[PDB]
Design a protein around this ligand. Structure first.
Ligand SMILES: Cc1cc2c(cc1C)N(C[C@H](O)[C@H](O)[C@H](O)COP(=O)(O)OP(=O)(O)OC[C@H]1O[C@@H](n3cnc4c(N)ncnc43)[C@H](O)[C@@H]1O)c1[nH]c(=O)[nH]c(=O)c1N2
Length: 452
DNA sequence: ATCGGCCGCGCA
DNA sequence: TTGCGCGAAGCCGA
């Protein structure tokens, strides 16, 4: 393994016991540098490797759509791990509290977790640290260049981070060895229970049936390898030319799998790299999954206030400030956006794309989040409604890519200042009629007319 | 250091 | 549509 992928969190005396992988972000058995590290420590010490996943009450902030998708990654994940003789364990509480009992109860010798830059991970890791005595390592298994190696500061834009990332790519772009089975030796209720809890929160139509359409993405590692091979085979060619057209389904549709870590961006990079197609389609796509996926981690990692106004750049702050008294063409309430009740049929279309499938089209997500800022009473409230719907309804929500994507839209983070306007100040504008030069907007509204 | 280099619109 | 040149606009890093 490339050692630079490892951070030592807590130093102590290596217990005699097993290596416990605390599985958080990267819920996969293959192409996992974290579990590949745990097994190596279990191997040298001739102790086993084991997985422990912590199911927290944060699922009740989202909905059936995400929770189902995730606890079927997990059922399949466990069949896979047992097949390698690595048993997995599923605790049901506060990680800081619960993971600390596990290591102590089970005489864990060494504890490993994967890397995530979101605030709450830090709260737990710091609680685990103060309650264990065995060593404690962290591994970046979600990025190609470990987040703290690509850059040590917040990067102002993609084109300041782009040299830094490619500087280090030949070293960190590499094949994955093979997860070696152990030598040394309930998820059904958990879902049935979680679901009954979330059942009065489903989005229904006027009729009783749910809004969500569960057949657009199958969850799992197996599914995610076919979404990836499908993209490489059918859409990667057309990607640069049609990535921006909401009527063509020419995206990878990989974001829900990456979010849960059911597939590794590094594998995807490897396979796109090796694959022949339009060299511009490969360049266009590699920038999305290398430069934009990883500066988004860079973002939350250096900006603890990443989901708030205070992390916008200074120019963006001043400008939105001076336009807090400008009169707004419309003001909608959370619940009115929520049910696509604006005058803008394009907006409502895209909101209807969000509610029924769980994945709104890449381009339409920009447009969507800017009209929230233009038609709400203040930036804080627009940031609030946009996080809220993003995380409530996007399969790929509750994710750095989310906070970094909203802050681009509403705040100009990783963007630049544009022609000053009312309400939106110097923040990049996007117009209806600009969409109309770009794609048959009429076809996209026809698609989603379930506003009942 | 001193400057290059990161959507909407008019038009053919 | 479809590409091009332009506009308005602040800031990083050679
Ligand atoms: C308003 C709004 C809200 C969000 C986001 C953007 C915007 C404008 N993003 C990011 C982005 O829109 C999203 O990653 C893409 O729709 C990914 O879909 P595909 O994988 O189908 O795209 P596509 O195949 O074109 O991109 C491939 C991969 O590159 C990365 N990438 C592409 N666009 C990116 C972007 N704008 N920012 C960062 N990485 C990007 C993603 O990992 C994506 O899976 C996000 N993403 C997410 O996973 N969860 C979220 O909740 C949000 N929230």
């Amino acid at each position: 393994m490339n050692p630079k992928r490892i951070r030592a969190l807590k130093s102590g005396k290596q217990g005699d016991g097993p290596v416990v992988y605390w599985m958080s972000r990267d819920q996969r058995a293959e192409d996992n540098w974290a579990l590949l590290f745990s097994r190596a420590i279990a191997k040298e010490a001739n102790v086993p490797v084991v997985v422990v996943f912590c199911l927290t009450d944060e699922f009740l902030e989202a909905g059936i759509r995400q929770y189902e998708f995730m606890l079927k990654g997990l059922q399949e994940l466990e069949v896979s791990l047992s097949r390698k003789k690595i048993p997995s364990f599923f605790l049901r509480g506060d990680p800081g509290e619960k993971i600390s009992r596990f290591v102590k109860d089970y005489n864990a010798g060494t504890l490993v977790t994967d890397f995530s830059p979101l605030r709450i991970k830090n709260q737990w890791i710091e609680k685990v640290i103060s309650g264990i005595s065995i060593p404690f390592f962290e591994v970046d298994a979600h990025n190609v260049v470990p987040c703290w190696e690509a850059s040590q500061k917040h990067e102002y834009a993609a084109h300041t981070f782009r040299p830094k990332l490619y500087a280090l790519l030949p070293e960190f772009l590499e094949e994955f060895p093979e997860l070696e089975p152990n030598s040394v030796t309930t998820l059904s209720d958990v879902l049935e229970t979680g679901v009954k809890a979330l059942l009065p929160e489903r989005a229904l139509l006027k009729n009783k049936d749910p809004l969500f359409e569960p057949w657009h993405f199958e969850p799992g590692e197996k599914a995610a390898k076919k979404v990836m091979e499908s993209f490489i085979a059918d859409r990667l060619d057309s990607y640069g030319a049609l990535r921006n057209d909401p009527t063509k389904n020419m995206l990878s549709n990989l974001s829900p799998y990456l979010h849960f870590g059911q597939i590794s961006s590094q594998r995807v990079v490897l396979e796109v790299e090796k694959a022949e197609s339009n060299p511009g389609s490969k360049k266009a796509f590699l920038d999305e999954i290398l430069i934009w996926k990883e500066i988004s981690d860079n973002f939350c990692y250096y900006n603890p206030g990443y989901d708030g106004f205070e992390s916008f750049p200074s120019w963006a702050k001043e400008s939105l400030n001076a336009h807090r008294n400008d009169v707004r063409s419309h003001i909608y309430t959370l619940e009115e956006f929520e049910a696509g009740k604006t005058h803008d049929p394009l907006w409502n279309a895209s909101q209807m794309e969000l509610l029924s499938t769980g994945k709104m089209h890449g381009y339409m997500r920009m447009y969507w989040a800017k009209k929230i800022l233009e038609w709400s009473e203040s930036p804080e409230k627009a940031l609030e409604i946009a996080i809220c719907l993003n995380d409530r309804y996007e399969l790929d929500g509750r994710d750095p890519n989310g906070y970094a994507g909203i802050a681009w839209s509403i705040g100009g983070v990783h963007d630049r200042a544009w022609g000053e306007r009312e309400v939106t100040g110097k923040i990049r504008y996007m117009s209806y009629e600009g969409c109309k030069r770009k794609f048959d907007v009429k076809l996209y509204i026809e698609k989603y007319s379930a506003l009942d």
